[PDB]
């Protein structure tokens, strides 16, 4: 069974360093070229670097030259990416992938096996739990919760301890100019229901050990 197991991602400040690992099993690792490919949030795929099967020839995208170093330990069947002098734009999910290559020179051919990715977040913000504000319904009615100013991702939002699921929309997080994230979760309910029915959004931000149950009422 062919495997590429990744690790080493995390949340760091600009200028700091990270080292990613990609441990291979189930094939002749030392006979494959290996790539690093990254995907910033909501963006496309960007090639990062490649290393030849024997570790001699290496190539990099321009934006990581002199900062990132691709390497491999064939005795451990592991590929590495040393990421130094990190920038906010380096924030992405980082994938490793094997490439059998083509030709006597063994240039890249295609990437048929991929790791599942490891997440790198570069930010000068520090860990912070969110504030949960109500999105109160007024005069089929909509209500919700505004989960504002937290870092890092992720937060989880359920409604009424998981008992209320239909009509619920939990939006993707946005990154504010402050460096803190914010997201909203809304649910639609019949207008008649509001007078008696209770509504609580259950917010959990594990990186800060913040757990907030916020009840949303008409004002």
């Amino acid at each position: 069974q062919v495997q590429l197991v990744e690790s080493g991602g995390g949340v760091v400040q600009p200028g700091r360093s990270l080292r990613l690992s990609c441990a291979a099993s189930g094939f002749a690792f030392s006979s494959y070229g290996m790539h690093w490919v990254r995907q910033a949030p909501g963006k496309g795929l960007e090639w990062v670097a490649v290393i030849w099967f024997d570790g001699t020839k290496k190539y990099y995208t321009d934006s990581v030259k002199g900062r990132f170093t691709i390497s491999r330990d064939n005795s451990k069947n592991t590929l590495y990416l040393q990421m130094n002098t990190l920038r906010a734009e380096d924030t992405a999910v980082y994938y490793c992938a094997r490439d059998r290559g083509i030709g006597a020179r063994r240039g890249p051919y295609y990437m048929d096996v991929w790791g599942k990715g490891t997440t790198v977040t570069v930010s000068s913000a520090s860990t912070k739990g969110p504030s949960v504000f109500p999105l109160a319904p007024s005069s089929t009615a909509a209500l919700g919760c505004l989960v504002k100013d937290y870092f890092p991702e992720p937060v989880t939002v359920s409604w009424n301890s998981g008992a209320l699921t239909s009509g619920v929309h939990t939006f993707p997080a946005v990154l504010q100019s402050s460096g803190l994230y914010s997201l909203s979760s809304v649910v639609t309910v019949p207008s008649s229901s509001l007078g008696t029915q209770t509504y609580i959004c259950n917010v959990n931000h594990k990186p800060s050990n913040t757990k907030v149950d916020k009840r949303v009422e008409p004002k």
């Binding site: 790539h35 490919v37 496309g44 795929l45 960007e46 090639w47 490649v50 190539y59 990099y60 995208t61 321009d62 994938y95 240039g107 890249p108 051919y109 295609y110 990437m111 048929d112 991929w114 790791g115 599942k116 990715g117 504030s131 504000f133 109500p134 999105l135 109160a136 089929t140 909509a142 919700g144 505004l146 504002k148 929309h169 939006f171 993707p172 997080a173 946005v174 504010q176 914010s182 997201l183 909203s184 809304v186 639609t188």
Partner: protein, 211 residues
């Protein structure tokens, strides 16, 4: 560097439809082009290599053609598991470059958005910031325009929005737009309006409140 231009960036289709995706290279790359499929939260999956060679195990409804600068990915009859994003990649010379991606989405009938506006809570106002939220709910197609007006001044640069993926049961979208103001600026004004443009609406729908 070899730029790969992918078109269209997005498309809506139904099960059984034929789908054609185009990737254009800035210079000739011979047959060194690959196609990948990617679904949310998942690693890319190789579909076709060397322009026309099917990766082992990929269903035969996927096919690829072209050489030089023009390349095509074809799904002969779309299946439910084929709604995803597709990427092309030149493997001719470093730096290796991908296309911008093509998102294949589900086709459905037009549905106008139900629009709601939410004033900031008193709780948040004690913090010194005011967030105003406009909710556009369960609409199709995805393209919608949101305009914030405070005392009829168009707000620009102080709002952010995010959109859900298509709902599993009705294939609709939902959009939220958050207008962020300081408490002082929020207290200085009265009329807060969110105006929505959508093809399901014969004219823009405005939801508003007075502070």
């Amino acid at each position: 560097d070899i730029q790969m231009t992918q078109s269209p960036s997005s498309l809506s289709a139904s099960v059984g439809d034929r789908v054609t995706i185009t990737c254009r290279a800035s210079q000739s790359i011979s047959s060194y082009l690959n196609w990948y499929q990617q679904k949310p939260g998942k690693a890319p999956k190789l579909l076709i290599y060397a322009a026309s060679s099917l990766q082992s195990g990929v269903p035969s409804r996927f096919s690829g053609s072209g050489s030089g600068t023009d390349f095509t990915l074809t799904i002969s009859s779309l299946q439910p598991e084929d709604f995803a994003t597709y990427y092309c990649q030149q493997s001719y010379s470093t730096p290796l470059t991908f296309g911008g991606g093509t998102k294949v989405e589900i086709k459905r009938t037009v549905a106008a958005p139900s629009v709601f506006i939410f004033p900031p809570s008193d709780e948040q106002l004690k913090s010194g910031t005011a967030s105003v939220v406009c909710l556009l709910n369960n609409f199709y197609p995805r393209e919608a325009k949101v305009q914030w007006k405070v005392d009829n001044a168009l707000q620009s640069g102080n709002s952010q929005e995010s959109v859900t993926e298509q709902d599993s049961k009705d294939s609709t979208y939902s959009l939220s737009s958050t207008l962020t103001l300081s408490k002082a600026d929020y207290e200085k004004h009265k009329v807060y309006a969110c105006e929505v443009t959508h093809q399901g609406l014969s004219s823009p729908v405005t939801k508003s409140f007075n502070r």
